[PDB]
């Protein structure tokens, strides 16, 4: 996260760390949506241009963390994956369209002050909240600069009009993405960055005071460049595949 701040303790209890067994490294962010299901970006697991293709046993999810590098004894839980599910039409060849995957944990996690799932949006929270100018919140342990934080970082960013997103890039933007970030003249900065992928873009409902995950940190060009924006998987547009996977398996 670039131009963010240190998270408060307990601030994002749904934030999950995707962790490589060996070499032991931070792969990506991810989010806890129930006691057994983690949501992340497909490109964290599967990205052939970079010879990235992880499987279940390659991987550990660490939940409840605040410190990037510490093993947080008595606070964090570390779980093994039972099954990764990538969207069947995830488009790694061209534009990272449908950049989304579900991971089933081998056993359920118990909730605590530091570990609690986020809501997925319904049609109407989506319609009401996903609007240009409205701010959401991104979190992660990724690079601070296009160097890495000791502690979870947080930044709040406004949703950007769809045409402005399209005109900022050569990349073909689809209906399954939105972009967020400050314009060059607005005079505030901030962006996700390398290592933040797969993490939650969340908004607080002003109707029921719950936090909803609207986006997954997907891709950008550099980090925090003026006139560039971060792009996110549109979780609501892909909710049907989420429901399907979850209650088939």
């Amino acid at each position: 996260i670039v131009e963010g701040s240190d998270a408060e303790i307990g601030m994002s209890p749904w934030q999950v760390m995707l962790f490589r067994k060996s070499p032991q490294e931070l792969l990506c962010g991810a989010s806890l949506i129930s006691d057994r299901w983690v949501l992340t970006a497909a490109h964290c697991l599967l990205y052939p241009p970079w010879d990235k293709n992880f499987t279940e046993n390659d991987l550990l999810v660490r939940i409840g963390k605040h410190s990037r590098t510490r093993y947080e004894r008595n606070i964090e839980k570390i779980s093994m994956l039972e099954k990764i599910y990538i969207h069947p039409r995830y488009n790694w060849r061209e534009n990272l369209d449908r950049d989304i995957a579900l991971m089933k944990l081998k056993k359920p996690v118990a909730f605590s002050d530091y570990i609690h799932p986020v809501c997925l949006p319904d049609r109407e929270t989506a319609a009401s909240l996903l609007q240009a100018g409205y701010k959401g919140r991104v979190t992660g342990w990724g690079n601070l600069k296009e160097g890495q934080p000791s502690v979870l970082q947080v930044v709040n960013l406004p949703i950007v009009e769809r045409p402005v997103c399209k005109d900022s890039t050569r990349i073909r933007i689809t209906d399954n993405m939105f972009c967020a970030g400050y314009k060059p003249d607005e005079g505030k900065r901030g962006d996700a960055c390398e290592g933040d992928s797969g993490g939650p873009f969340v908004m607080k409902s002003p109707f029921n005071n719950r936090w909803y995950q609207m986006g997954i940190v997907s891709w950008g060009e550099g980090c925090d460049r003026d006139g560039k924006y971060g792009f996110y998987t549109h979780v609501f547009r892909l909710k049907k595949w989420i429901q399907k996977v979850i209650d088939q398996f």
Binding site: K21, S22, Q24, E25, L26, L60, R62, T69, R70, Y71, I78, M80
Partner: peptide, 11 residues
């Protein structure tokens, strides 16, 4: 950089 975690998990 990363503090070692329980080997229970790296099993």
């Amino acid at each position: 950089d990363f503090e070692e975690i329980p080997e229970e998990y790296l099993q």
